[PDB]
Amino acid sequence: GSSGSSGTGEKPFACTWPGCGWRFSRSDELSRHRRSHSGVKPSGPSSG
Ligand SMILES: [Zn+2]
Numbered sequence: 001g002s003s004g005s006s007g008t009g010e011k012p013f014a015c016t017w018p019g020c021g022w023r024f025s026r027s028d029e030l031s032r033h034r035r036s037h038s039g040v041k042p043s044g045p046s047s048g
Contacts, residue, residue, distance in 0.1 A: 008025075010025060011023035011024050011025045012025075013025070013026065013027055013029065013030035014030075015030065015033060015034065015037075016034070016039075017034070017037040017039070020037065
């Protein structure tokens with residue numbers, strides 16, 4: 001719209017995948033995203 005962002009607006013967690021440019025203010029928010037891409041997962045026979 002018109003009103004921009006001044007109060008909040010900071011995401012240190014930036015995706016590692018190449019070309020991608022998704023950032024998150026929280027870690028979990030970034031980890032859950034990484035899923036979208038194909039990469040070695042910390043899980044194997046089981047995961048929560
Ligand atoms: Zn990404």
